[PDB]
């Protein structure tokens, strides 16, 4: 698994690969590693698929309940804090979940990294999963805060593509989103092999 | 530890050795392994001393209350069932076999084995660490229709053979004969024990 996220001048880019595995066996090449909590809130998944899917859906439930009760959409920081506290109750029981909470509330764009250990950090850019180190290299070498939308899409597409090329547990399709002030939009779903061949041309 | 109980027309004969050991050291060489649960019901303890004593005391208490409630001498089967239940319920915690032998007015003299929670009635029963060495002997010597005197002899011989071979057994032989008339104890000291091939 490779997932990344970075904030630039025109919002937040979120990109993931779609490979799931069981040992050396590729169980799926089309798994969805982004949950859509609401129109301006997203969550990435990496680690144990059952843990990620279950806890991120439970966060979505609480976010929806938060909205109904307080009559407003939960902030990115509060949503990430909710998840952080939820998984801290099972610390040490071998949960495996590394996720990013991306959205856009009243304090502009927001990106948080949350993991099963209880780590919770706000930042400008993050990468998780087994192919994260490879993604960091590409992302960091081509990141500029004044990147244009098309340029930001390319960087995201490149970072993930290269991670799938080197990391055995990453691959399939790159799914990318773009968090904007009026909500997120799904950018593309490009097969990483199509991309890689064109990059080597 | 070697324990034995034999059935005979009219009652039972229970017997055991008197050795309590702690590794290679004899902590008690004259211990009585035969405990009375009721007026006409006895039990032979084997395995862990603390466990056997804890269970026997528990059963005696339960049977005592039972006896008074029903206003009638308890059945030997009831005593065995009371022991079986305790032994089965705490099978992972306890490590002792409480052999059950006695006499009641319903089914005469009965011998029950309650090792590990399992309950079975037999003509004669042997238990403890020294019982393994006398399995062949009791199988070849036991004959149906044995009289009380013959049962005590059979019991004495078997236990004596086990005591000489088993390091965890030894000392004297405690003997008990239960019948309608009552309970009659007997102790066979070291010098009066049956002699066999000890060479």
């Amino acid at each position: 698994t490779t997932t990344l996220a970075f904030k630039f001048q025109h919002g937040v880019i979120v990109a993931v690969d779609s490979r799931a595995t069981a040992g050396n066996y590729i169980s799926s090449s089309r798994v969805n590693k982004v949950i859509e909590i609401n129109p301006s809130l997203l969550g990435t998944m990496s680690g144990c698929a059952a843990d990620c899917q279950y806890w991120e859906r439970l966060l979505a439930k609480e976010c929806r309940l938060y909205y109904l009760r307080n009559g407003e959409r939960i902030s990115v920081s509060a949503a990430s804090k909710l998840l952080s506290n939820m998984v801290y109750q099972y610390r040490g029981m071998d949960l495996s979940m590394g996720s990013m909470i991306c959205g856009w509330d009243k304090k502009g764009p927001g990106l948080y990294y949350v993991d099963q250990n209880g780590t919770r950090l706000s930042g400008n850019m993050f990468s998780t999963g087994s192919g994260s180190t490879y993604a960091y290299g590409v992302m960091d070498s081509g990141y500029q805060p004044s990147l244009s939308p098309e340029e930001a899409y390319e960087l995201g597409r490149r970072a993930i593509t290269y991670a799938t090329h080197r990391d055995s547990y990453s691959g399939g399709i790159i799914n990318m989103y773009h968090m904007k002030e009026d909500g997120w939009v799904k950018v593309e779903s490009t097969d990483v092999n199509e991309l890689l061949h064109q990059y080597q041309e | 530890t070697t324990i034995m109980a034999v059935e005979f027309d009219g009652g039972v004969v229970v017997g055991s050795d008197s050795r309590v050991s702690a590794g290679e050291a004899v902590v008690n060489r004259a211990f009585n392994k035969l405990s009375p649960l009721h007026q006409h019901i006895y039990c032979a303890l084997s395995g862990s001393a603390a466990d056997a004593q804890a269970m026997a005391d528990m059963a005696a208490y339960q049977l005592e209350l039972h006896g008074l409630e029903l206003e009638e001498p308890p059945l030997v089967l009831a005593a065995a069932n009371v022991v079986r239940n305790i032994s089965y319920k705490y099978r992972e915690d306890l490590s002792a076999h409480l052999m059950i032998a006695g006499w009641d007015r319903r089914d005469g003299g009965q011998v029950y084995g309650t090792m590990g929670g399992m309950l079975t009635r037999q003509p004669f029963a042997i238990g403890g660490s020294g019982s393994t060495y006398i399995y062949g002997y009791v199988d070849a010597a036991y004959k149906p229709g044995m009289s009380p005197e013959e049962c005590r002899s059979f019991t004495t011989n078997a236990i004596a053979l086990a005591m000489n071979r088993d390091g965890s057994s030894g000392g004297v032989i405690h003997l008990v004969t239960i019948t309608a008339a009552g309970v009659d104890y007997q102790v066979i000291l070291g010098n009066e024990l049956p002699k066999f091939y000890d060479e």
Partner: protein, 204 residues
């Protein structure tokens, strides 16, 4: 497991008067890929090839030691080694390290030097040969290869049909195996020619 440390898949297929041998081209340590053109299939004659899958270091050692023995064997006796004889040579070589074996499961594919009769076999790490009349697979995705071969393999296939069969078997088999891929090389061994092709494969 030591056999999956570097990954890799090798398979041999029998056709009508022709043999096919294919393998993946990935060389990686655990989850990390290092190169995408690691040689796993080595020539042991004009129409004799050996495919090796398993620990990369042992793949290279065994290949080199086998070459050493084959060269000497082909200098001593003045003739090209027969496919069956090579199998025994390899089995003997693998059995020598019975209690400290080379981590590699070889597959041999070729045609008899004088009769041009198709021959394929596979050996386990300690050297237990297994001659078949259809196909032999070896590697981290052997189960996937079995499925593909079992349903795709047909008797008496011609050079073109055999190529398509083994290509489809390998391609689809390595796509379900995370540590096998990065290209596929296929060798088609015929009486008068050898055709080497690199397939268009997934590089993830």
């Amino acid at each position: 497991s030591i056999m999956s440390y570097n990954g890799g898949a090798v398979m041999a297929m029998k056709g009508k008067n022709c043999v096919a041998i294919a393998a993946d081209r990935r060389f990686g340590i655990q989850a990390q890929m290092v190169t995408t053109d690691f040689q796993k299939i080595f020539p042991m004659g004009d129409r004799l090839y050996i495919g090796l899958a398993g620990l990369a270091t042992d793949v290279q050692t065994v290949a080199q030691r086998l070459k050493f023995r084959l060269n000497l064997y082909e200098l001593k006796e003045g003739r090209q080694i027969k496919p069956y004889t090579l199998m025994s040579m390899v089995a003997n070589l693998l059995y020598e390290k019975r209690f400290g074996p080379y981590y590699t499961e070889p597959v041999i594919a070729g045609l008899d030097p004088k009769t041009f009769k198709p021959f394929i076999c596979s050996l386990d790490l300690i050297g237990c040969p297994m001659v078949t009349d259809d196909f032999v697979v070896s590697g981290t995705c052997s189960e996937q290869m079995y499925g593909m071969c079992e349903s795709l393999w047909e008797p008496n296939m011609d050079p073109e049909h055999l190529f398509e069969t083994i290509s489809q078997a390998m391609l689809n088999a390595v796509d379900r195996d995370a540590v096998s891929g990065m290209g596929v090389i296929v060798h088609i061994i015929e009486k008068d020619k050898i055709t080497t092709r690199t397939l268009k494969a997934r590089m993830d």
